[PDB]
Amino acid sequence: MTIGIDKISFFVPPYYIDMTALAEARNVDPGKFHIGIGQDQMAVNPISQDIVTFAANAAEAILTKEDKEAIDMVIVGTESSIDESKAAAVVLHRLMGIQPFARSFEIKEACYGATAGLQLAKNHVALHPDKKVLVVAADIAKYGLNSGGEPTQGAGAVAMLVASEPRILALKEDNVMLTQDIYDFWRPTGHPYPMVDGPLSNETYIQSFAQVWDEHKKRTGLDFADYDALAFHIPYTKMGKKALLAKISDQTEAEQERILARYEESIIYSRRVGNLYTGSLYLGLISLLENATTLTAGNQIGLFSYGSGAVAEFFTGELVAGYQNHLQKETHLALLDNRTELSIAEYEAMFAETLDTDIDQTLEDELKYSISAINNTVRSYRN
Amino acid sequence: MTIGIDKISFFVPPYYIDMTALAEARNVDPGKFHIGIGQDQMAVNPISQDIVTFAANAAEAILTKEDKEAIDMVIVGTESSIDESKAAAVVLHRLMGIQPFARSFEIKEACYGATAGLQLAKNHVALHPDKKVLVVAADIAKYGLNSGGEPTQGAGAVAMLVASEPRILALKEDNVMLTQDIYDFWRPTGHPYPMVDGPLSNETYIQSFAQVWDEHKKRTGLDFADYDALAFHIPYTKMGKKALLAKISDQTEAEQERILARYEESIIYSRRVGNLYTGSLYLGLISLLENATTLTAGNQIGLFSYGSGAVAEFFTGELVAGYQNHLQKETHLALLDNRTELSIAEYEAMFAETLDTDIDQTLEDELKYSISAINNTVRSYRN
């Protein structure tokens, strides 16, 4: 009895700004974003769209009436929460029309939250193979206009349906996790933007991959030659490549070329979206599934999840025969291609706008599940 | 192949106020507090003590060198977080000296967070019987001076070590969960105090218990007569009693008296502490274990967990032979009896003090694991 990802999809807001345009606005070479950090288009969202908006849209793309009856646990991994007490998963459970007898909660641990949700969901289904779990990564990565991390911004969500006999990825039991108390990135209660140490963050991310990889190789004997592809969590596409390069220098030239090629395929979507925090790794998985042409049933996919703070985990998934018939490539490509390009001026205006929850008001937004009103701080969503 | 709570303990700050004194200061009949709400002493903490302080002290009371090597997952259930990104479990992992290869994260779902952690931990150990999980409920329940919820305030944490072949409580697979999108209590980002609807909170709590209890009875056929004791989430002691009274009116009188008698034993500690949010249910469990003389190995304990928002769950646990030899009654009684009583003036001063994490500073507190300094918003702890 296999357990894993049966269906998976991502959602990003209907807006974006071109990185060449941003570079010019920031008076820098129109290419240090395309080649330096490796980003081409950045996802941007108005104040009328939050993690629930994204989580709801992504989940709607994969849930059938039968799934809604079989799901008895809803989990949202995020570091962009809108309430200190009420889990965003409760609202998602309502909007998705999931059956009432289910537990719902939010998991927090930076960009690692959704991974924790996925593993816990896996265990749940392993013990109750007739049930399913909805795990959704949702985040809004905003650093600030004219900020150091501004170029790495992103927003969206990745929804996953975990079930027994999954049709896409069967998860293995070779998990290797690590916890280290390091302040590379964090966001004190009350801070709308995160505190970030770039140098320490790059270093901790690269070293954490090296550490869980080495420990994983000790325990399993599995090396790069044993992996058909690797999905990485990434703040920006070049970080991941950096972490990979630092560990594959002793592999054969052909193997290095193969690994780096698989990596490039895993970041196709990311270059058009930006950092999704909890959802970055999973956007990478989706990219591999829909864009990596050499992958086939039985192939082994290695996944490296990272979370500042910091927590990391490496685990493996096996592609299920017929997975290609259960993807959302058409939907995803249309979602990206149909976005409206914003000028830098429109972008800064949309980015700087603040939603004051303390003010009763109504909001206009055509997007389904967007915030429609605020009353006594409570958000209403247009479904 | 049994799975559950191996060790459990709680920690509360070293200060409290007499509810009679609070009543007099608020010009309220003392009986409203002692009898109406069912609270006698309220736990109060200075700004130098946070959820980490409480979680660390609670966990330290039950962790051996062996436990620290076998634990590969650390979970903190809370709704009093100090960071929007970095899980409090990460710092706890460091302070407790737990082996490095573990995953750590925070679960958020109001007063239900710790329960979610316990259930997921249970599945983890079920699949990996050689491993253990540290699950800690930690919260600071502050409503505000002269607020409606002020009398129900509390603070502290409850640490539980989850493992196979547990020495205290063996958990059963009879869980009945429920999720409903209800705004009875919540705390928007940026709000130091929670938004609360007294009436809706009471009614949702009572109706949620009725729903999961009825569904549980439907699925298992088990009724009140089949339970030797019941532990309820305790926002205030009369809460569980109200929910119980609304559901046992049809039972025989002997049965009703037995149920209410066992309930009284479950709230002995809570009457001296107040609301611990995520830890209330589990403080009730500890109270039952350490205070009920007639309970024995083999007895079935029913547990009702509730979290505003709202999520609820009913599940059963069985007392393990020899559990009476693995409790912490002496430690707990000393912890409660040795607290310093604050005058209402001292209480209001301590309660109103704020920590500006944005200010570098040193703090002086004799308590182990209390905050010792703040540098660039980062907290250091005394140890």
Ligand SMILES: CC(C)(COP(=O)(O)OP(=O)(O)OC[C@H]1O[C@@H](n2cnc3c(N)ncnc32)[C@H](O)[C@@H]1OP(=O)(O)O)[C@@H](O)C(=O)NCCC(=O)NCCS
């Ligand atoms: C718990 C809470 C609702 C009580 O608010 P409140 O306005 O003080 O309670 P009320 O004024 O309605 O009356 C208090 C109770 O004591 C009784 N009472 C009042 N004065 C009394 C006195 N002098 N002697 C004895 N009983 C007295 C009342 O009859 C009432 O009993 P009942 O509700 O069981 O019938 C409030 O503190 C709160 O907002 N709590 C936060 C939310 C919460 O904890 N919800 C629980 C669900 S998880």
